[PDB]
Amino acid sequence: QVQLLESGAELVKPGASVKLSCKASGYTFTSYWMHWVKQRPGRGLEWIGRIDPNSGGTKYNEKFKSKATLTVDKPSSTAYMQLSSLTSEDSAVYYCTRRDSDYWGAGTTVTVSSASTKGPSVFPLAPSSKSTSGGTAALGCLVKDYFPEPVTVSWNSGALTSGVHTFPAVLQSSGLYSLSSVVTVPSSSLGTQTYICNVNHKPSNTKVDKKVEPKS
Amino acid sequence: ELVMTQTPKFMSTSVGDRVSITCKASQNVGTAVAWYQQKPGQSPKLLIYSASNRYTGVPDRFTGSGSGTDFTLTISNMQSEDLADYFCQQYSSYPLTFGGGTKVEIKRTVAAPSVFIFPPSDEQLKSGTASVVCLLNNFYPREAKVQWKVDNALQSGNSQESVTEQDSKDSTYSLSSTLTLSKADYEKHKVYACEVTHQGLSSPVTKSFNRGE
Numbered sequence: 001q002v003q004l005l006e007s008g009a010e011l012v013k014p015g016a017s018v019k020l021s022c023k024a025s026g027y028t029f030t031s032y033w034m035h036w037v038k039q040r041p042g043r044g045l046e047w048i049g050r051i052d053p054n055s056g057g058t059k060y061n062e063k064f065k066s067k068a069t070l071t072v073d074k075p076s077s078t079a080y081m082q083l084s085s086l087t088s089e090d091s092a093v094y095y096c097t098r099r100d101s102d103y104w105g106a107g108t109t110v111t112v113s114s115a116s117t118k119g120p121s122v123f124p125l126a127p128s129s130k131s132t133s134g135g136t137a138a139l140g141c142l143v144k145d146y147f148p149e150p151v152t153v154s155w156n157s158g159a160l161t162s163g164v165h166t167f168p169a170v171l172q173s174s175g176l177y178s179l180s181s182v183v184t185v186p187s188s189s190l191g192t193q194t195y196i197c198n199v200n201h202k203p204s205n206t207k208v209d210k211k212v213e214p215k216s
Numbered sequence: 217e218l219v220m221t222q223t224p225k226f227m228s229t230s231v232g233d234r235v236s237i238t239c240k241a242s243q244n245v246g247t248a249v250a251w252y253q254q255k256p257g258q259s260p261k262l263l264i265y266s267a268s269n270r271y272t273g274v275p276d277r278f279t280g281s282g283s284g285t286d287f288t289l290t291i292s293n294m295q296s297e298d299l300a301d302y303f304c305q306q307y308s309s310y311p312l313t314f315g316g317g318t319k320v321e322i323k324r325t326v327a328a329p330s331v332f333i334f335p336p337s338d339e340q341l342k343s344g345t346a347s348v349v350c351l352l353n354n355f356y357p358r359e360a361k362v363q364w365k366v367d368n369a370l371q372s373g374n375s376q377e378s379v380t381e382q383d384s385k386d387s388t389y390s391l392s393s394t395l396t397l398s399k400a401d402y403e404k405h406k407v408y409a410c411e412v413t414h415q416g417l418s419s420p421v422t423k424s425f426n427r428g429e
């Protein structure tokens with residue numbers, strides 16, 4: 001069967017360059033053009049350009065003219081895309097797809113950052129005191145300034161799962177990730193029931209347990 | 217470049233419903249338009265090509281139509297497995313261009329968000345930055361407006377929003393808006409408010425606190 005094998009994930013420092021790979025199999029590499037596509041949650045999907053593996057001829061989207069360079073290596077049946085002098089604007093998922101877009105690579109996620117492995121700081125999102133007697137209060141943990149991804153969060157070592165909402169990690173203007181995990185609980189348990197968020201950041205072999213309680 | 221305008225950006229449906237997605241081209245592209253489906257963590261999957269040609273293996277449920285500058289992707293008898301993102305693309309001229317996409321979601325009754333605001337906590341201040349968090353919990357639909365006001369002053373460019381995917385049990389969303397500022401600025405002001413507007417509310421709900429309790 002036809003398959004396009006891509007790198008998967010690349011970490012690039014601002015100003016550096018990276019060469020993504022797309023190895024083809026299950027068909028004659030030189031018989032089909034190969035397209036490259038960029039995807040960001042905001043910008044959406046963008047066609048970067050294409051290359052004819054047989055001739056080496058290329059065609060680029062003006063928008064990536066000075067950014068991407070497409071090449072191929074027949075011996076290894078692999079297509080390449082060189083992305084140069086990266087900035088945060090270049091962070092995205094990049095795909096290679098055959099001529100008709102019937103077959104796609106799995107995508108290579110590229111993250112551009114100057115940050116080094118760093119465990120998260122964990123701050124309490126304390127339950128409002130003297131708030132609503134509706135019997136329902138919200139509390140949580142602000143998990144910020146960690147790198148790279150990912151981080152996991154549980155509550156009371158996993159015993160508490162109902163009403164838990166752990167938000168997607170967002171990027172700040174620092175190159176470090178941040179996110180919050182919240183949970184709503186009976187406003188009557190406050191002070192009596194203990195609530196602890198367990199944050200684990202495998203990358204730095206860092207784990208944090210933080211008790212979240214009403215502020216004095 | 218030829219711009220493909222795709223509408224709607226979001227569309228909620230119930231199992232069995234008909235889903236209709238539109239892509240309008242800034243200029244004639246004949247019938248050189250394709251439609252794709254994409255689920256989280258996966259590459260797009262080809263559904264239709266040549267505007268109306270269903271790709272091998274694609275369910276009869278998916279039908280592409282149109283030509284020139286007006287194209288339609290129709291999903292009849294919508295199934296739960298059809299919950300995903302959909303994109304159109306024109307390949308009549310270079311550069312190839314894609315529509316902005318449509319996320320098909322689960323419909324449910326309107327639900328107003330429960331709002332909560334959280335102070336920075338003395339502990340974080342030591343870092344030099346103050347983080348103020350506003351929580352919009354269990355609401356529907358996703359459309360929501362959050363405005364930050366420090367001492368009645370509308371903020372801009374210093375906040376970020378994050379939204380969860382639809383809850384597996386109740387199909388609602390939750391959202392967090394975080395206002396980031398230096399400890400200096402935070403100490404300079406006293407009133408911190410989060411104003412929320414949502415279809416489920418008869419009037420904006422504002423939650424706030426005064427620095428130092």
Ligand SMILES: CCC1=C(C)c2cc3c(CC)c(C)c(cc4nc(cc5[nH]c(cc1n2)c(C)c5CCC(=O)O)C(CCC(=O)O)=C4C)n3C
Nearest residue numbers: 032033099100101102249250262264265266271272307312
């Ligand atoms: C990404 C957009 C795209 C979609 C969707 C698409 C759909 C598609 C499919 C998939 C089911 C098939 C079997 C063919 C079917 C075909 N598609 C093409 C040719 C092309 N098809 C192209 C693009 C394209 N084709 C481009 C670009 C070329 C030109 C590249 C070239 O010079 O080969 C041909 C001609 C190639 C040949 O046999 O000489 C057939 C047949 N096309 C029209």
